[PDB]
């Protein structure tokens, strides 16, 4: 008889989220994230970036656009460097596993809902 | 002890999908879709569009690009007309309710997974 309400759907979505939080994928992400916070080269580059971001806000505000563009290029060069660090590559692989899982859930749900609608139209 | 596997997550995602299929939102979509298939003006416009789409493939293949562009404009004019029909507006409102529900589920899951990761980093 009774149709599920949106509160019922959302409550079960929070149950699914808690199960996703207890996966090897989210486990690997948590472990990969803890390693980046213990890497000296990561520390150095993030701190250079943060100092530059500080100069960038100043330069934007005084309309020193040429100097701003040099600062933004240097931020882009440091961001590129960060991505080459193997603890950062491992963290990116772990982020991709979590995002791939959420995407598989959404697609699974979307496809099955669409399927059940199509079969109902007869 | 044991972490959920991706099969476990996906099986529960299919359980969530079946609950979404038994909502007032999906109920309204199914009822709104059945009405469009019983509307004479919808029938007439969809059949004009389909005939034009047939001419369009021909004209594209012979590289009659000027005539193709007239045919594509007429398809666009008929598509606009379809959207003004109140059974089509009702169907669009119902499609938006279903899509809004799936989006609320994905965001609910995404936010809660992110939240639980942030709280774990301490
Ligand atoms: Cl399917
Ligand atoms: Cl939150």
Author numbering:
A (entry chain A), B (entry chain A): 1 to 122
Text lifted from the article:
Outside this region, in each RicA protomer, helices α3 and α4 together form flaps that extend in a nearly orthogonal direction from the helical bundle core. Despite the fact that RicA and RicF have only about 20% sequence identity, their monomeric structures as well as the structures of RicA and RicAF are nearly identical. In fact, superposition of RicA dimer and of RicAF revealed a root mean square deviation (RMSD) value for 166 aligned Cα of 0.982 Å. The most poorly aligned portions of these structures occurred in the α3-α4 flaps, suggesting that there may be some flexibility in the turns connecting α3 to α4 and α4 to α5. Of 36 buried RicA residues in RicA-RicA, 28 are also buried in RicA-RicF. Because there is no evidence for a RicA tetramer, it would appear that the association of RicA with itself precludes tetramerization and, indeed, the tetramerization interface between RicAF dimers involves only RicA-RicF contacts (rather than RicA-RicA or RicF-RicF contacts).
In Bacillus subtilis, the RicA (YmcA), RicF (YlbF), and RicT (YaaT) proteins accelerate the phosphorylation of the transcription factor Spo0A, contributing to genetic competence, sporulation, and biofilm formation, and are also essential for the correct maturation of several protein-encoding and riboswitch RNAs. These proteins form a stable complex (RicAFT) that carries two [4Fe-4S]+2 clusters. We show here that the complex is a 1:1:1 heterotrimer, and we present the X-ray crystal structures of a RicAF heterotetramer and of a RicA dimer.
